[PDB]
Amino acid sequence: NLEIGKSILAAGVLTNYHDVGEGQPVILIHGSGPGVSAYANWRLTIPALSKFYRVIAPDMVGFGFTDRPENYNYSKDSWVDHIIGIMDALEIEKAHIVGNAFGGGLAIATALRYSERVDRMVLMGAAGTRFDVTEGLNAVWGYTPSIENMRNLLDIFAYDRSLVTDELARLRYEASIQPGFQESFSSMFPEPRQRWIDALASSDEDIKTLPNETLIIHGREDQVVPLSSSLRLGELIDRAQLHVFGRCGHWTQIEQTDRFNRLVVEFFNEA
Amino acid sequence: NLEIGKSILAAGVLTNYHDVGEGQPVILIHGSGPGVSAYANWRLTIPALSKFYRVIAPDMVGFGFTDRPENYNYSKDSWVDHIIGIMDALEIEKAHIVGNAFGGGLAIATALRYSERVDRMVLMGAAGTRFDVTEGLNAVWGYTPSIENMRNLLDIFAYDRSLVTDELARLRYEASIQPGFQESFSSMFPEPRQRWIDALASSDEDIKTLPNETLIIHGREDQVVPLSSSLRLGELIDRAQLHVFGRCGHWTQIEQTDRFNRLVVEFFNEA
Numbered sequence: 001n002l003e004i005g006k007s008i009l010a011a012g013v014l015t016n017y018h019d020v021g022e023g024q025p026v027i028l029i030h031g032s033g034p035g036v037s038a039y040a041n042w043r044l045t046i047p048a049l050s051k052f053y054r055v056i057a058p059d060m061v062g063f064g065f066t067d068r069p070e071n072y073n074y075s076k077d078s079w080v081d082h083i084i085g086i087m088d089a090l091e092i093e094k095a096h097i098v099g100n101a102f103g104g105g106l107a108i109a110t111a112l113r114y115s116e117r118v119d120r121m122v123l124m125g126a127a128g129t130r131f132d133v134t135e136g137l138n139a140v141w142g143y144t145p146s147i148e149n150m151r152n153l154l155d156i157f158a159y160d161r162s163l164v165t166d167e168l169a170r171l172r173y174e175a176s177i178q179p180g181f182q183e184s185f186s187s188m189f190p191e192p193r194q195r196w197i198d199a200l201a202s203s204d205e206d207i208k209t210l211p212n213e214t215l216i217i218h219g220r221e222d223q224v225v226p227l228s229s230s231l232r233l234g235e236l237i238d239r240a241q242l243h244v245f246g247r248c249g250h251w252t253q254i255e256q257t258d259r260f261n262r263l264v265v266e267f268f269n270e271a
Numbered sequence: 272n273l274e275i276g277k278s279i280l281a282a283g284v285l286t287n288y289h290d291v292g293e294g295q296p297v298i299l300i301h302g303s304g305p306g307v308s309a310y311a312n313w314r315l316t317i318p319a320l321s322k323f324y325r326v327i328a329p330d331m332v333g334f335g336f337t338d339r340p341e342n343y344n345y346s347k348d349s350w351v352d353h354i355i356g357i358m359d360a361l362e363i364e365k366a367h368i369v370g371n372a373f374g375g376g377l378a379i380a381t382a383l384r385y386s387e388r389v390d391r392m393v394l395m396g397a398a399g400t401r402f403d404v405t406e407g408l409n410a411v412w413g414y415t416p417s418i419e420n421m422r423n424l425l426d427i428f429a430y431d432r433s434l435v436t437d438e439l440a441r442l443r444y445e446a447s448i449q450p451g452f453q454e455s456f457s458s459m460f461p462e463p464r465q466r467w468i469d470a471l472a473s474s475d476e477d478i479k480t481l482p483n484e485t486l487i488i489h490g491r492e493d494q495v496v497p498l499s500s501s502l503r504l505g506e507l508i509d510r511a512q513l514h515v516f517g518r519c520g521h522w523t524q525i526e527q528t529d530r531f532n533r534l535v536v537e538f539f540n541e542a
Contacts, residue, residue: 220505231502234491234515241530244505244513259512262537270530 003039003175004065010058011085016065017058018042021050025095026268028057029083029103030064031250033153034143034185035175037064041100045253048261053268056095058086060106068184076200080110087117096268098122101225101250105200112206120271122264124217125225125250127200128207129232133193136223136250141189141196145182147173159221159249207236214240215267217260219248241267274310274446275336281329282356287336288329289313292321296366297539299328300354300374301335302521304424305414305456306446308335312371316524319532324539327366329357331377339455347471351381358388367539369393372496372521376471383477391542393535395488396496396521398471399478400503404464407494407521412460412467416453418444430492430520478507485511486538488531490519512538 005018018038026049030041038057049055059066061082062074072078083106087095096119099107104126111118136156143149151169155161176182189196214237218230227244234242243263245256253260276289289309297320301312309328320326330337332353333345343349354377358366367390370378375397382389407427414420422440426432447453460467485508489501498515505513514534516527524531 220511234517238517240491240517242513242515242517246505246509246511246513259541266533 002043003037005039008086008089010089011082013061013069013082013085014067015058015061015082015086017056017086018046019054019056019090020046021052021054024053024268024271025092026053026055027083027087027092027095027097028055029097029099029106030057030060031100032063032102032189033140033157034145034150035172035178035181037175040175042253044257045098045261045264049265052265053096056086056090056092060103062184062188068180074188076106076109079106080113083110084114084117093117094119096120096122096271098124098264099126100124100253102127102200104128105202108202108207108210109200111210111212112202115211118212120213120215120268122215122217122267123230123233124252125219125222126216126230126233127197127225128202129204129229129236130198130201131226131229131232133197134224134226137197137225138193140224141193142191143176143185145173145177150176156223157250159219159247159255163255204236207233208238210237212237212239213267213271215263216240216242217252217263218242218244219250219252219255220244220246221248222250224250273314274308276310279357279360281360282353284332284340284353284356285338286329286332286353286357288327288357289317290325290327290361291317292323292325295324295539295542296363297324297326298354298358298363298366298368299326300368300370300377301328301331302371303334303373303460304411304428305416305421306443306449306452308446311446313524315528316369316532316535320536323536324367327357327361327363331374333455333459339451345459347377347380350377351384354381355385355388364388365390367391367393367542369395369535370397371395371524373398373471375399376473379473379478379481380471382481382483383473386482389483391484391486391539393486393488393538394501394504395523396490396493397487397501397504398468398496399473400475400500400507401469401472402497402500402503404468405495405497408468408496409464411495412464413462414447414456416444416448421447427494428521430490430518430526434526475507478504479509481508483508483510484538484542486534487511487513488523488534489513489515490521490523490526491515491517492519493521495521
């Protein structure tokens, strides 16, 4: 299973992660869908970025193949603690961070609590602001295992549904039913789910204090996180750039791969 | 005067233009401020693009050093005719077009009337949609010559006013009072100016039919054309990408030069 990489103790949690490349460190933080993992989200991104940077992609606690501690208290702050724990474990003193959706919210939160540890940020269809729960997000977080339910979620993420094949739905369905996966996922964002969007968000006041050069990316047709959320982030963050991809959903790094990789590499190259 | 380049008869008008580079043709269309010219707008863009493309930058009739025909009937359609006349004169059968503000409106109009002649488009703080006249635009189009009035206009265009020096205001003031310049400019967009924003615009219905890969660029702080206008263009054009620069005004190609040039070259490279 290529989703299983290296293992390291971070913030007291045995963590599964990928580490490819040399040079300036870049931390990639995945999203929060069922069966999600660092490899699943970043397999098409790591190869491109690792040619110029040291790319670290960990499975956040509660997701992927990282340990799922008994009675673990999941929260925005605990996840930030995990990110910092991973950086500490790898002697990464300061790094750029690419946060995908759920991961974008964590990136913003990490930059606010540990400003000295974060350089540039890329926020994709990111959590971080309070937006009204969408039917797409409620469907994603409310997922129960089945190939048809996974096919529907994949359709919700994609602009071009032709990319959603029976094989892909089957493979992700299988990833979603791995031991302990659905159990931690279902108890992660229970109804009412607006509570979790709000919990993952950072206040307008706090976001306005971010000094980091930031690149906000969003798919025009995103059905999970509304474009309006990134428009708001763009008005709050001072050194921000916004890039919106037309004909693109919640899979910006997968549906607009080459454009995405070029934008991100050049953005970091500027530093 | 470096603003004076080559001369060619286009659409019956003796036209001043710049032609640098080899390969795929790219037409750069300047904005509509007092003293504006192709060189003034694109001096920092041509060098970068000409390394990979053949760059054509003409002074639109009524602006710069192109002839100002007696009793000439200026209109969106006549300007489009001029653009096509320039392309015809240079045997440019199909080209990419970069339209800056006023020029963006003309680019959209050209792509609608001569779809076969236009490939990819870059629209910067572009005209093209109906937006309420801003005080910034009313000040720009209502300009009367003076170093102080020019300094104010430059401030309206810029995010970082430190770039507006006495020398720059003086030089542009001098450009604005060249023989016949202020005369054609003042009679170009007379009050009420909303009429001209509306005249330069294309209907939502027509814009929706554009099949061209398009890159929409806008400065978050643009005081002349509101960001909301480009947000609208992004929702209308199907194959569109939107890139918004924070800490940037109506001079995207000048205030974010390196980022702008990289974005444009890679966008065209995709073709």
